[PDB]
Design a protein around this ligand. Structure first.
Ligand SMILES: Cc1cc2nc3c(=O)[nH]c(=O)nc-3n(C[C@H](O)[C@H](O)[C@H](O)COP(=O)(O)O)c2cc1C
Ligand SMILES: Cc1cc2nc3c(=O)[nH]c(=O)nc-3n(C[C@H](O)[C@H](O)[C@H](O)COP(=O)(O)O)c2cc1C
Lengths: 376, 376
């Protein structure tokens, strides 16, 4: 089983290739990590296994979901340390994902009633909604296109949060640069309509992620930094005219940060598009799944380092990704929600619990969170 | 179950509201309807049920898929008659969809390797592919822009094909005016860059569809003519700057044809964009379809007659569409591919077979065509 062949990720001797993908679950009441998160991550931790935490706030204004943890206050750092300790007790490696949602926010998640920040003034279109604290779905407001001088302040929020993650004992951080959130709002030319130095050419649109990555690398070292992107994705109106061109520009700048830093990053983490659009048309799907495979393998061959693939993976698709050399590590999300011992189950090819979508984002510290059964 | 309320479509007393949507399947080898088509439509026919055939060529220049049937020769009429006879023997109503692909073709599909015809010289871009006869995907080429006299010849091709369909025994015809094919290449201001009386204003862009519909109405009668459009679907680079305005402008012209002809069309058939809610993303399952639903309801409210909705419909969505008054009839494509007895399965709320996209457009007369199983 290729998934259980060991993998060296930097200084990390991983015993298997099954990774816990970062997943928002909204159990961090009032944005402070809770003991429930400890039991949750403890359940999924394995000897030599890699975990990535839920997206975590870098500033008071950076959230777009309820009860997501932060790591911008000293109190949050203190509570994360307790979670990290129990994961390390089980011998696992754990990175904290740093998450700014940008224009994907709401007045209820904005402490000063300010408009959410972004590259653009364009709002998320009406077919997307936000989760409200009462469980209802809300409308995304109009964001504010931030000026040049404001870029550095947000970059600084990543740096201070990265230092805070290290203070809490995390083995590293992951930059959430995917899925139409703040960093992806600069990357994608379907969102980024700016005319200043952060807009226009591929090089200009890549400046924000480059400056974010360089700041956290200069703060905690390249070996403790992973980066997540999704060049091709249908999420929150993030589309690009040439996803392949965009992906290789990001890879080329990441490769260059490694060259000048003299150390590789922890990894590149890329979401599988899993294109299913225009399925009701005559020609909309012709050659789509072939374009998608080419996208991923082209990025993988170009990136000089560890490659993690994510999105719609199953036990069979994960085996084949590693077997064909398509990725070094495979992260699982939904199956890891409902199977605390997904790693063991994948080893044994056991039956897999089915996830209950209804409790993905509810606030109960147990129900839908820690009461999915182990193998008996 | 509102889908099994009877519906009166003109003279036709339909016993239920589940419609077979028109679907290209490429089993009509060398453009001649085959016996396999008779078995396929017979499997799906029900007493009082309405069927619409796959897109059918109106001329040697109208195809952009391999082995699609024509109805522009007498040999084709004779073979279609056998299929119509077995469908009528089961008590179903059947219309033949008349299809010209315009610029969505390739030299391999054109007489003497000629360029495809269109409103414009602009090609479909390389984000779309054409299916080639050998099963690979090819590149759409530059079309030739036709002038006023040749437009009138294409209109006559529609008229002659409509007469041929009646000669074969069809209950009527459907004009394929959707999905970025020839008529939509005149409708959509993202495609139509003409400056003559067929380009520019909404009125000019609607001239071609009005001419086509008027010509067939005057040949066989409005009661035997249905019209299909998709103002909000941008398949094959067919975008309009104001889809709802374009949709209402088309509806206006159809209402006017009906008043001047003194009788209603069989129906207006509209395919709507349908956005798959991705489960792998943070907010994919929080989406809203309200905006697309309001577009469809506004077109239906504006049109004086029978409305067929299509695009991503399920059992539950079809029930809701009829129950809320949003449509009179609901057409199903992909689920009708894999469920020959889809009508009965929806009536009983039975499980549905999954369709296999790999055999949507292959040539076998059985495999992936007639060997999907009935309820047992
Ligand atoms: C409930 C849920 C929450 C998620 N939260 C995040 C997140 O906070 N940050 C992130 O980068 N991806 C997030 N994702 C995407 C996952 O990390 C992962 O890419 C996806 O679940 C993998 O596909 P799979 O569920 O088929 O395994 C989330 C996915 C789900 C289903
Ligand atoms: C394989 C396939 C072939 C199709 N061929 C045609 C066609 O020839 N003419 C047409 O107007 N629409 C065609 N369509 C679109 C369907 O008529 C219909 O609008 C769509 O399939 C409905 O969505 P559903 O599959 O979710 O039911 C086709 C769709 C598919 C999947």
């Amino acid at each position: 089983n290729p998934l259980f062949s060991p993998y060296k990720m930097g200084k990390f001797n991983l015993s298997h290739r099954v990774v816990l993908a970062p997943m928002t679950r909204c159990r961090a009441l009032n944005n402070i990590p809770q003991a429930a998160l400890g039991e949750y991550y403890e359940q999924r931790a394995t000897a030599g296994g890699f975990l990535i935490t839920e997206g975590t706030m870098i500033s008071p204004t950076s959230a777009g979901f309820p009860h997501v943890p932060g790591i911008f206050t000293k109190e949050q750092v203190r509570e994360w340390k307790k979670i990290v300790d129990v994961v390390h007790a089980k011998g696992a490696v754990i990175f904290c994902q740093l998450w700014h949602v940008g224009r994907a926010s709401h007045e209820v998640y904005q402490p000063a009633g300010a408009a959410p920040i972004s590259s653009t003034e364009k709002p998320i279109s009406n077919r997307w909604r936000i989760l409200m604290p009462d469980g209802t779905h809300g409308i995304y407001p109009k964001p504010r296109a931030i000026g040049t001088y404001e870029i550095s302040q947000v970059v600084e929020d990543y740096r201070r949060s990265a230092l805070n993650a290290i203070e809490a004992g995390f083995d590293g951080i992951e930059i959430h640069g995917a899925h139409g959130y703040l960093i992806d709002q600069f990357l994608k030319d379907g969102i980024n309509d700016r005319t200043d130095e952060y807009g226009g050419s591929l090089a200009n649109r890549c400046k924000f992620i480059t400056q974010v990555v360089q700041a956290v690398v200069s703060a905690i070292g390249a070996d403790r930094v992973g980066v997540r992107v999704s060049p091709a994705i249908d999420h929150l109106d993030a589309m690009d005219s040439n996803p392949l061109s965009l992906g290789l520009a990001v890879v080329e700048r990441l490769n260059k940060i490694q060259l000048h830093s003299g150390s590789k990053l922890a990894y590149l983490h890329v979401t599988q598009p899993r294109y299913v659009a225009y399925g009701q048309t005559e020609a909309g799907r012709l050659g789509s799944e072939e374009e998608e495979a080419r996208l991923m393998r082209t990025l993988r061959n170009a990136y000089q380092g560890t490659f993690i693939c994510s999105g719609g993976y199953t036990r069979e698709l994960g085996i084949e990704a590693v077997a064909q050399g398509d990725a070094d590590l495979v992260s699982y999300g939904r199956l890891f929600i409902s199977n605390p011992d997904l790693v063991m189950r994948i080893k044994l090819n056991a039956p897999l619990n089915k996830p209950n979508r209804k409790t993905f984002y509810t606030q109960d510290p147990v129900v839908g969170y820690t009461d999915y059964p182990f193998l008996q």
